[PDB]
Design an enzyme around this catalytic site. Structure first.
Site, PDB file in Angstrom:
ATOM      1  CG  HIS B  72     -63.138 -77.742   4.505  1.00  0.00           C
ATOM      2  ND1 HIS B  72     -63.392 -77.965   5.838  1.00  0.00           N
ATOM      3  CD2 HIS B  72     -63.673 -78.801   3.846  1.00  0.00           C
ATOM      4  CE1 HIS B  72     -64.052 -79.098   5.982  1.00  0.00           C
ATOM      5  NE2 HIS B  72     -64.234 -79.627   4.791  1.00  0.00           N
ATOM      6  CE1 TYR B 201     -59.089 -75.249  13.158  1.00  0.00           C
ATOM      7  CE2 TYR B 201     -57.667 -76.042  14.889  1.00  0.00           C
ATOM      8  CZ  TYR B 201     -57.985 -75.952  13.559  1.00  0.00           C
ATOM      9  OH  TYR B 201     -57.194 -76.564  12.630  1.00  0.00           O
ATOM     10  N   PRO B 293     -50.226 -80.082  16.794  1.00  0.00           N
ATOM     11  CG  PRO B 293     -51.608 -81.793  17.493  1.00  0.00           C
ATOM     12  CD  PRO B 293     -50.240 -81.243  17.698  1.00  0.00           C
ATOM     13  CE  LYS B 297     -50.086 -74.114   8.663  1.00  0.00           C
ATOM     14  NZ  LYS B 297     -50.974 -74.194   7.472  1.00  0.00           N
ATOM     15  CE1 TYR B 385     -55.993 -74.046  10.354  1.00  0.00           C
ATOM     16  CE2 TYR B 385     -57.005 -74.307   8.202  1.00  0.00           C
ATOM     17  CZ  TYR B 385     -56.780 -74.770   9.479  1.00  0.00           C
ATOM     18  OH  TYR B 385     -57.336 -75.953   9.870  1.00  0.00           O
TER      19      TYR B 385
HETATM   20  C1  LIG Z   1     -53.319 -86.008  16.203  1.00  0.00           C
HETATM   21  C2  LIG Z   1     -52.470 -85.465  15.083  1.00  0.00           C
HETATM   22  C3  LIG Z   1     -53.066 -84.642  14.221  1.00  0.00           C
HETATM   23  C4  LIG Z   1     -52.381 -84.092  13.146  1.00  0.00           C
HETATM   24  N1  LIG Z   1     -53.030 -83.287  12.314  1.00  0.00           N
HETATM   25  C5  LIG Z   1     -52.417 -82.825  11.226  1.00  0.00           C
HETATM   26  C6  LIG Z   1     -53.207 -82.189  10.106  1.00  0.00           C
HETATM   27  O1  LIG Z   1     -54.447 -82.008  10.147  1.00  0.00           O
HETATM   28  N2  LIG Z   1     -52.398 -81.743   9.019  1.00  0.00           N
HETATM   29  C7  LIG Z   1     -50.994 -81.832   9.017  1.00  0.00           C
HETATM   30  O2  LIG Z   1     -50.251 -81.377   8.153  1.00  0.00           O
HETATM   31  N3  LIG Z   1     -50.350 -82.473  10.067  1.00  0.00           N
HETATM   32  C8  LIG Z   1     -50.999 -83.010  11.088  1.00  0.00           C
HETATM   33  N4  LIG Z   1     -50.336 -83.815  11.962  1.00  0.00           N
HETATM   34  C9  LIG Z   1     -48.969 -84.513  11.668  1.00  0.00           C
HETATM   35  C10 LIG Z   1     -48.454 -85.599  10.726  1.00  0.00           C
HETATM   36  O3  LIG Z   1     -49.251 -86.759  11.014  1.00  0.00           O
HETATM   37  C11 LIG Z   1     -46.960 -85.870  10.747  1.00  0.00           C
HETATM   38  O4  LIG Z   1     -46.198 -84.638  10.666  1.00  0.00           O
HETATM   39  C12 LIG Z   1     -46.564 -86.730   9.538  1.00  0.00           C
HETATM   40  O5  LIG Z   1     -47.093 -88.051   9.723  1.00  0.00           O
HETATM   41  C13 LIG Z   1     -45.075 -86.897   9.320  1.00  0.00           C
HETATM   42  O6  LIG Z   1     -44.745 -87.728   8.219  1.00  0.00           O
HETATM   43  P1  LIG Z   1     -43.269 -88.398   8.174  1.00  0.00           P
HETATM   44  O7  LIG Z   1     -43.300 -89.132   6.912  1.00  0.00           O
HETATM   45  O8  LIG Z   1     -42.234 -87.337   8.367  1.00  0.00           O
HETATM   46  O9  LIG Z   1     -43.143 -89.328   9.453  1.00  0.00           O
HETATM   47  P2  LIG Z   1     -43.953 -90.564  10.006  1.00  0.00           P
HETATM   48  O10 LIG Z   1     -45.359 -90.507   9.568  1.00  0.00           O
HETATM   49  O11 LIG Z   1     -43.703 -90.702  11.490  1.00  0.00           O
HETATM   50  O12 LIG Z   1     -43.339 -91.895   9.383  1.00  0.00           O
HETATM   51  C14 LIG Z   1     -41.961 -92.190   9.592  1.00  0.00           C
HETATM   52  C15 LIG Z   1     -41.783 -93.595   9.138  1.00  0.00           C
HETATM   53  O13 LIG Z   1     -40.473 -94.042   9.376  1.00  0.00           O
HETATM   54  C16 LIG Z   1     -40.461 -95.340   9.992  1.00  0.00           C
HETATM   55  N5  LIG Z   1     -39.273 -95.616  10.811  1.00  0.00           N
HETATM   56  C17 LIG Z   1     -39.044 -95.232  12.091  1.00  0.00           C
HETATM   57  N6  LIG Z   1     -37.860 -95.604  12.537  1.00  0.00           N
HETATM   58  C18 LIG Z   1     -37.287 -96.288  11.461  1.00  0.00           C
HETATM   59  C19 LIG Z   1     -36.132 -97.016  11.360  1.00  0.00           C
HETATM   60  N7  LIG Z   1     -35.258 -96.972  12.356  1.00  0.00           N
HETATM   61  N8  LIG Z   1     -35.930 -97.733  10.236  1.00  0.00           N
HETATM   62  C20 LIG Z   1     -36.788 -97.635   9.264  1.00  0.00           C
HETATM   63  N9  LIG Z   1     -37.996 -97.108   9.316  1.00  0.00           N
HETATM   64  C21 LIG Z   1     -38.162 -96.382  10.433  1.00  0.00           C
HETATM   65  C22 LIG Z   1     -41.633 -95.297  10.862  1.00  0.00           C
HETATM   66  O14 LIG Z   1     -42.106 -96.610  11.094  1.00  0.00           O
HETATM   67  C23 LIG Z   1     -42.643 -94.520  10.015  1.00  0.00           C
HETATM   68  O15 LIG Z   1     -43.264 -95.464   9.148  1.00  0.00           O
HETATM   69  C24 LIG Z   1     -51.015 -84.409  12.962  1.00  0.00           C
HETATM   70  C25 LIG Z   1     -50.400 -85.326  13.832  1.00  0.00           C
HETATM   71  C26 LIG Z   1     -51.095 -85.893  14.833  1.00  0.00           C
HETATM   72  C27 LIG Z   1     -50.318 -86.864  15.720  1.00  0.00           C
END
Ligand SMILES: Cc1cc2nc3c(=O)[nH]c(=O)nc-3n(C[C@H](O)[C@H](O)[C@H](O)COP(=O)(O)OP(=O)(O)OC[C@H]3O[C@@H](n4cnc5c(N)ncnc54)[C@H](O)[C@@H]3O)c2cc1C
Ligand SMILES: Cc1cc2nc3c(=O)[nH]c(=O)nc-3n(C[C@H](O)[C@H](O)[C@H](O)COP(=O)(O)OP(=O)(O)OC[C@H]3O[C@@H](n4cnc5c(N)ncnc54)[C@H](O)[C@@H]3O)c2cc1C
Lengths: 392, 392
Positions: B72, B201, B293, B297, B385
């Site tokens: 995009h 947006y 969100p 980021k 952005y």
């Molecule tokens: C509606 C929405 C829209 C978004 N839009 C965007 C976008 O367009 N672009 C962008 O950059 N970001 C966006 N974000 C965010 C993004 O989805 C998160 O920041 C990202 O998923 C984080 O990745 P992570 O690996 O840190 O954590 P997570 O995805 O939360 O995964 C953590 C993992 O650890 C596991 N875990 C938890 N506790 C334990 C435990 N005690 N033992 C072992 N395993 C455990 C969990 O089960 C999970 O599988 C959005 C978020 C949402 C909710």
């Protein structure tokens, strides 16, 4: 689902709070992460203060306790080739402590609840608390794949040190006080008669040792070990030899050893969080604080928090005096800090600390000699050991 | 079990860190609480910065992305009966963003790992971290009833907002910065063609709305809703009518609606913890910070933390330069605060805040008019952005 008081955790704090409330007519639901079996597998505590004994009688779960509990009038501290007994009954003005296992207390409460028909959801996964500062907080959880919601007036976080409750309060809202000790306790449960009719706390050059019991044919022993130890490195054989090495010859030669029913290492720590509440959420027991097991205060402080919360919820519901709940943390913390101080004191004079200079060792020895030889000294241990009075 | 780097959590942060490490020859074990299915059920993110795109190419998992991702060159902000487009490509000096679902990114990484043969234990219950400040930390967990131990050099806490990692650091060692917004996002995934070739947006009197997509036949829409709303109160029908009410007439009349594949409410919050490490434990992604969100980021900051930790572990292992790890938090926080500021800014100018006086509403409107009409203004949105440069 909807209830009046949602309770997170079915350990003794939760079951006790739930039993008292139910008896007073206040509906409550208990959500436990594990199965009844896993909760029942925990050995833990053995010594109960009179306050807890009375609280169980009020909750109507004291039959088996009145029959199987052992009332103890004194304890014994051994150090420097000496064995000093503290007459608790005499020095505290008539009070005593009761030896009855936490597993038993838990079992009794589980049975009472089962019979009462009050709601209890075991294996409640993914518990999350919502709208804590609103008028209508709720709890969400998963039960066999489906996510249920539970609406309630108040939430009592009785989920222990690793519960979700304490984590659900904004970090910036809590001030934590913690101290981790450089050692743990290696405990061993055996189906043998206890070496003494009363407990023996022992300060020894090799480290601390404690001779306890659960009944006349079931004993519970502990020895201080480094945090680097693994339970698999300690065979029953090795445990018995070490315990013996840390006790007075006359006590050691009267010891009936035997295979262990349980063996585990518990690290020591002091932990207090302030305040103990946030909106409609109130913390109780291990969810709010931890004490080294040396003074036998953990379960006992859970009872005073629970007795306090119960009595405040009674005024709120029965008398419409909900403003009183604001006072929960103040009342509880007063008792908690004193029990934390005593448990800290007990731990420091009975344990072997690493990197201790000559002066500190001598002061540690002198602390024992003084406190165990002064009538005013013995009284400070006794009144604290039996338990300080519950505030009203 | 023994490994070099133990990784807690198999979301994108963990899998990405694990894939890069494996490729560089550094052994790693991933411990996930849930099942592969549950991880794959999460919709979440859709927009990726070039930095992440390049990081996936380096990890060798960019095939499907290069083919299915949509590049995009601009986005669009609608407000006050106006529709202003921000030419990202031009204003940022040639950079662009890529639309590719988080579920897809996750799936691609899971497959790459499966093939590589690197260790991954799903359904690892009761994860506990030990001896974080020692030279030999270890992790304990339960796998089908039995408690296993995993010895390792370093631990990477990639367990998200509710992970065990952040909770395993002494509370007194961390300073938390948090802000909770008075609203959430109601998202809806549909198998229909997106209303636009670029994102829209929208600031509207009824509240915020966002028109996004996953592909040419799959869309993702959101509308701001109060924290008191329940997803069951919002039928597809109700969602479509409301979305329409919040968009420009010409955009609304070109909307192809349809039944939802997914519907959920995500509350908004800003959260940063300092520092992001403790001994041999390093936090990455959601375990260390949360962003609304609005600026897209979250996943993108997880990538920069991971790229940073990966590159520091490479020097430690490959070049014996382990002192460099001390720098992890400083490097990361610099980028995190800037992304937190932008996401906060985006959220404040696009959302409808409760209890806003006349002056604030006018300033909010003026912020948009100024920033969207000034070449220097548009550039500040564009460069932020597309994503600020990764520090070396
Ligand atoms: C509606 C929405 C829209 C978004 N839009 C965007 C976008 O367009 N672009 C962008 O950059 N970001 C966006 N974000 C965010 C993004 O989805 C998160 O920041 C990202 O998923 C984080 O990745 P992570 O690996 O840190 O954590 P997570 O995805 O939360 O995964 C953590 C993992 O650890 C596991 N875990 C938890 N506790 C334990 C435990 N005690 N033992 C072992 N395993 C455990 C969990 O089960 C999970 O599988 C959005 C978020 C949402 C909710
Ligand atoms: C070796 C040792 C010796 C001790 N000796 C004594 C003694 O002699 N006398 C004394 O007073 N104290 C003693 N103590 C302490 C005492 O065992 C504890 O203070 C007491 O068990 C605390 O009760 P609780 O109900 O607060 O918490 P817990 O017993 O920890 O129970 C909390 C419950 O909440 C559940 N839970 C956790 N997370 C969640 C969740 N997310 N969702 C739902 N459920 C959840 C847990 O599964 C658990 O069932 C000793 C402790 C030990 C370890």
């Amino acid at each position: 689902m909807k209830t009046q008081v949602a309770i997170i955790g079915a350990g003794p704090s939760g079951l006790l709070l739930g039993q008292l409330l139910h008896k007073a007519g206040i509906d409550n639901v208990i959500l436990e992460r594990q199965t009844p079996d896993e909760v029942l597998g925990r050995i833990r505590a053995g010594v109960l203060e009179q306050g807890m004994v009375d609280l169980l009688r009020e909750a109507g779960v004291d039959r088996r306790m009145a029959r199987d509990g052992l009332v103890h009038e004194g304890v014994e501290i051994a150090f420097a080739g000496q064995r000093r007994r503290i007459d608790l009954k005499r020095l505290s003005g008539g009070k005593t402590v009761t030896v009855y296992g936490q597993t038993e207390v838990t079992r009794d409460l589980m049975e009472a609840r089962e019979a009462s028909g009050a709601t209890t959801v075991y294996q409640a996964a993914e518990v999350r608390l919502h709208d804590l500062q609103g008028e209508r907080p709720y709890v969400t959880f998963e039960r066999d794949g489906e996510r249920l919601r539970l609406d309630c007036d108040y939430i009592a976080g009785c989920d222990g040190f690793h519960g979700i409750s304490r984590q659900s309060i904004p970090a910036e809202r809590l001030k934590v006080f913690e101290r981790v000790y450089p050692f743990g306790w290696l405990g061993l449960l055996a189906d043998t008669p206890p070496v003494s009719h009363e407990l023996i706390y022992a300060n020894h050059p090799r480290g601390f040792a404690l001779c306890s019991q659960r009944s006349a044919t079931r004993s519970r022993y502990y020895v201080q070990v480094p945090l680097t130890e693994k339970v698999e490195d300690w065979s029953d054989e090795r445990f018995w030899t070490e315990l013996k090495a840390r006790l007075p010859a006359e006590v050691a030669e009267k010891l009936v050893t035997g295979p262990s029913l349980e063996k585990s290492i518990a690290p020591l720590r002091s932990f207090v969080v302030e305040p103990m509440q946030h909106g409609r959420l109130f913390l109780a027991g291990d969810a709010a604080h931890i004490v080294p097991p040396t003074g036998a205060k953990g379960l006992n402080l859970a009872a005073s928090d629970v007795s306090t919360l119960y009595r405040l919820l009674l005024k709120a519901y029965r008398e419409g005096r909900g403003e009183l709940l604001e006072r929960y943390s103040a009342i509880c913390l007063r008792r908690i800090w004193k029990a934390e101080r005593f448990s800290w004191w007990m731990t420091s004079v009975l344990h072997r600390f690493p990197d201790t200079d000559a002066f500190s060792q001598r002061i540690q020895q002198t602390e024992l000699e003084y406190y165990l030889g002064s009538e005013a000294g013995l009284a400070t241990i006794a009144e604290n050991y039996v338990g300080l009075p519950y505030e009203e």
